[PDB]
Design an enzyme around this catalytic site. Structure first.
Site, PDB file in Angstrom:
ATOM      1  N   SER A  80       0.809  -1.210   0.000  1.00 54.92           N
ATOM      2  CA  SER A  80       0.000   0.000   0.000  1.00 54.92           C
ATOM      3  C   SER A  80       0.849   1.271   0.000  1.00 54.92           C
ATOM      4  CB  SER A  80      -0.935   0.009   1.214  1.00 54.92           C
ATOM      5  OG  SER A  80      -1.808  -1.117   1.201  1.00 54.92           O
TER       6      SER A  80
ATOM      7  N   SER B  68       2.360  -7.180   1.390  1.00 54.48           N
ATOM      8  CA  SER B  68       1.244  -6.538   2.071  1.00 54.48           C
ATOM      9  C   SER B  68      -0.032  -6.651   1.223  1.00 54.48           C
ATOM     10  CB  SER B  68       1.623  -5.070   2.336  1.00 54.48           C
ATOM     11  OG  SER B  68       0.823  -4.494   3.357  1.00 54.48           O
ATOM     12  N   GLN B  69      -0.653  -5.522   0.871  1.00 55.13           N
ATOM     13  CA  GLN B  69      -1.856  -5.572   0.036  1.00 55.13           C
ATOM     14  C   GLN B  69      -1.552  -6.339  -1.260  1.00 55.13           C
ATOM     15  OE1 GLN B  69      -5.162  -2.828  -2.350  1.00 55.13           O
ATOM     16  NE2 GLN B  69      -3.991  -1.876  -0.673  1.00 55.13           N
TER      17      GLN B  69
ATOM     18  N   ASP C 145       4.561  -8.914  13.200  1.00 55.25           N
ATOM     19  CA  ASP C 145       3.879  -8.263  12.082  1.00 55.25           C
ATOM     20  C   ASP C 145       2.411  -8.640  12.244  1.00 55.25           C
ATOM     21  OD1 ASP C 145       2.799  -7.195   9.766  1.00 55.25           O
ATOM     22  OD2 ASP C 145       4.179  -8.195   8.385  1.00 55.25           O
TER      23      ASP C 145
ATOM     24  N   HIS D  82       6.366  -5.026  10.048  1.00 58.86           N
ATOM     25  CA  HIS D  82       5.759  -5.090   8.715  1.00 58.86           C
ATOM     26  C   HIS D  82       6.636  -4.394   7.669  1.00 58.86           C
ATOM     27  CE1 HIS D  82       2.557  -5.639   5.831  1.00 58.86           C
ATOM     28  NE2 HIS D  82       2.412  -4.343   5.622  1.00 58.86           N
TER      29      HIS D  82
END
Length: 197
Positions: free
Chosen positions: A26, A104-105, A159, A172
């Site tokens: 993101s 992540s995303q 995370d 993260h």
């Protein structure tokens, strides 16, 4: 650097043997973000510049933070964008071995796309790497319809996204070392397992 469109720009007459499709995290820039460039450089070292095409997921994938809260962990438009890239790879270079990854995303996006992919194309992805996998707990560390042996998940202790939450904590943002070593190590190994050398 942060933007690579090797697949889109590439000549069908001279297809690379390996095509890597990667989705950024993101708010990250270009279509490769913070981890993509490191992976790319190492892949190029192993297969050579002409041997591998690096393709980030751009287009409709805006990597909007808020979309992490949507049902699949990303938007429908983003999934369609990534699916289209796998389809383009399959059409442009039918003999190339595919590899994928996401952070992540982007990891959720990679998982969702692979899950929806036509089995014949999905089966061409020799290996997939997911960093800070937001659907790690929900999916039990797997990508639906995809073999565990072809999957590698990097989820740091602490995370929170790997533990079912959407809270972004320091761990993260600590995937640099993994992107530099074990990630490309795994991808290279998986490609060589099926292509030999």
């Amino acid at each position: 650097r942060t933007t690579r469109d090797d697949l889109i720009n590439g000549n069908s007459a001279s297809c690379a043997d390996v095509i890597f499709i990667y989705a950024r995290g993101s708010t990250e820039t270009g279509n490769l973000g913070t981890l993509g460039p490191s992976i790319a450089s190492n892949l190029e070292s192993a297969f050579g510049k002409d041997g591998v095409w690096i393709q980030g997921v751009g287009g409709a994938y805006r990597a909007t933070l808020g979309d992490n809260a949507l049902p699949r962990g990303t938007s429908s438009a983003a999934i369609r964008e990534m699916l289209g890239l796998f389809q383009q790879a399959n059409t442009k270079c039918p003999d190339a071995t595919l590899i994928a990854g996401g952070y992540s995303q982007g990891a959720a996006l990679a998982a969702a796309s692979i899950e929806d992919l036509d089995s014949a194309i999905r089966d061409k992805i020799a290996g997939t790497v997911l960093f800070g996998y937001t659907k790690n707990l929900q999916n039990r560390g797997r990508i639906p319809n995809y073999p565990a042996d072809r999957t590698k998940v990097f989820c740091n202790t602490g995370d929170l996204v790997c533990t079912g939450s959407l809270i972004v904590a320091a761990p993260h943002l600590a995937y640099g070392p993994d992107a530099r070593g074990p990630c490309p190590e795994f991808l290279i190994e998986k490609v060589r397992a099926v292509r030999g050398s």
